[PDB]
Design a protein around this ligand. Structure first.
Ligand SMILES: *[C@@H]1O[C@H](CO)[C@@H](O[C@@H]2O[C@H](CO)[C@@H](O[C@@H]3O[C@H](CO)[C@@H](O)[C@H](O)[C@@H]3O)[C@H](O)[C@H]2NC(C)=O)[C@H](O)[C@H]1NC(C)=O
Ligand SMILES: *[C@H]1O[C@H](CO)[C@@H](O[C@@H]2O[C@H](CO)[C@@H](O)[C@H](O)[C@H]2NC(C)=O)[C@H](O)[C@H]1NC(C)=O
Ligand SMILES: N=C(N)NCCS[C@@H](CC(=O)O)C(=O)O
Ligand SMILES: *[C@@H]1O[C@H](CO)[C@@H](O)[C@H](O)[C@H]1NC(C)=O
Ligand SMILES: [Zn+2]
Length: 380
């Protein structure tokens, strides 16, 4: 009964800009179109914010984000996110799922992180590299500071704009879209040895559940065989894979997220054909709609709440949330609010902060959703 997208076709920059503006102009109450910077060839890195309170962070409200077309010729992601912009705007108010989603989450959608590369891409290209890098011929997904390999390529304008953007909002969950395979890729993307081996992150548990939440809804992806005749060597149990194990990739945007912010980012491969003919687009939406939707909901799982000041009674900014045996702490935002993605289990969470006395609580996360837990810390 929900309204499906109708605008199925490839959108070159000009038309994407026209497209985005259309929704921002037609649904001003639940949208906010903004730019986070420009590409080498001066194209806007547009982001579409969608929520019932566009332009403001609401205390306790999770910041989510989708990013596509980081590699110019991997187009499916770009179109799906445009399809998603449409689906969300057109269904808000009439569709209970979309309404409830847009009201409880602040969704940021960037259709193309490499618009210059896109323009240099050839429709029909299945596995080529023309249009992949940015205007200066650098791989944006090799451009981020890496925890193991020492990155040499000069930081590009698209990379910088995005790093800034990631520092701007309290992003909790994220996913950047690619093409060239069919699987959801999770951290870490590389290892100290720089080879194809499993590279576990402190949050390996959640990442597998987060990745599975998407692949499970994409029937063909879940089957585990991206394209038996094109890349016969590829087999991903249940449609997910640790980055490094598939193959070593240093300088990725995915790991940079986890290691430099509170955001947990996953990389999604939407299909073996990088730049399919426009006639195939509607099928990709049909096969990923439920996935795109279910993934966003994962942002509401785990634990969340506030770290307040016993005297003031108001949130503490930049407080820390440490969990049982997971060496990856999370920080609080301006209203002392935090979100910590965790798998079903029991944890010993500890809120702490400069100038206050730490509190520890035994929290319990279930298989269904998120539990609210606040921490009131006394001063020192
Ligand atoms: C897209 O941009 C990336 C850079 O971000 C290009 O990859 C880089 O390609 C150069 C040339 O192949 C590589 O340098 C060479 O490395 C080998 C291996 O050590 C060395 O023997 C050569 O003397 C030379 O230094 C470089 O390693 C590689 N960098 C990365 C991050 O992969 C890529 O070629 C670009 N794509 C296209 C189609 O131009
Ligand atoms: C823990 O702290 C939060 C932050 O104040 C509490 O949320 C407030 O709840 C009261 C009463 O329900 C409201 O008047 C405030 O507007 C809420 N603040 C928000 C959501 O911004 C929360 O109820 C407290 N207790 C827990 C653990 O839920
Ligand atoms: N960590 C690994 N091995 N893969 C993650 C997907 S990014 C990869 C594939 C893509 O470009 O789509 C790339 O950087 O080229
Ligand atoms: C925020 O907290 C971190 C520790 O988690 C600290 O290193 C950093 O300096 C703090 N930022 C501020 C408020 O200066
Ligand atoms: Zn890619």
């Amino acid at each position: 009964q929900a309204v499906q997208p109708v605008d199925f076709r490839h959108h070159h920059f000009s038309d994407m800009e026209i497209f985005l503006r259309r929704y921002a102009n037609e649904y001003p109450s639940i949208t906010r179109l903004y730019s986070v910077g420009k590409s080498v060839e001066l194209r806007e890195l547009y982001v579409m914010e969608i929520s019932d309170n566009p332009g403001i962070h609401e205390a306790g409200e999770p910041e989510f984000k989708y990013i596509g077309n980081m590699h110019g010729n991997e187009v499916v992601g770009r179109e799906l996110l445009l399809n998603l912009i449409e689906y969300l705007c057109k269904n808000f108010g009439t569709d209970p799922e979309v309404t409830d989603l847009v009201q409880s989450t602040r969704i940021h959608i960037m259709p193309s992180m490499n618009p210059d590369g896109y323009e240099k891409s050839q429709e029909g290209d299945r596995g080529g590299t023309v249009g992949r890098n940015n205007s200066n011929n650098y791989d944006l997904n090799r451009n981020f500071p890496d925890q193991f390999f020492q990155v040499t390529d000069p930081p590009q304008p698209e990379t910088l704009a995005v790093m800034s953007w990631l520092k701007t909002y309290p992003f909790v969950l994220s996913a950047n879209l690619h093409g060239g395979s069919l699987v959801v890729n999770y951290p870490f993307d590389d290892d100290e040895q720089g080879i194809a081996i499993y590279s576990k992150s402190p949050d390996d548990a959640v990442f597998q559940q987060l990745a599975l939440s998407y692949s499970k809804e994409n029937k063909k992806m879940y089957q585990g065989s991206p394209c038996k005749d094109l890349y016969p060597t590829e087999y991903f149990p249940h449609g997910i894979t640790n980055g490094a194990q598939w193959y070593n990739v240093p300088g990725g945007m995915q790991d940079w997220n986890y290691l430099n912010t509170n955001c947990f980012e996953v990389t999604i491969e939407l299909g073996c054909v990088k730049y399919p003919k426009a006639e195939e687009l509607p099928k990709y939406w049909e096969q990923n709609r439920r996935s795109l939707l279910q993934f966003i909901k994962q942002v509401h799982r785990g634990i969340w709440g506030f770290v307040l000041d016993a005297t003031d009674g108001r949130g503490i900014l930049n407080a820390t949330i440490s969990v049982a045996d997971i060496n990856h702490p999370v920080t609080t935002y301006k209203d002392g609010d935090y979100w910590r993605l965790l798998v079903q289990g029991t944890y010993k969470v500890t809120a702490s902060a400069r100038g206050y006395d730490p509190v520890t609580k035994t929290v319990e996360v279930d298989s269904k959703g998120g539990v609210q837990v606040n921490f009131t810390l006394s001063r020192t």
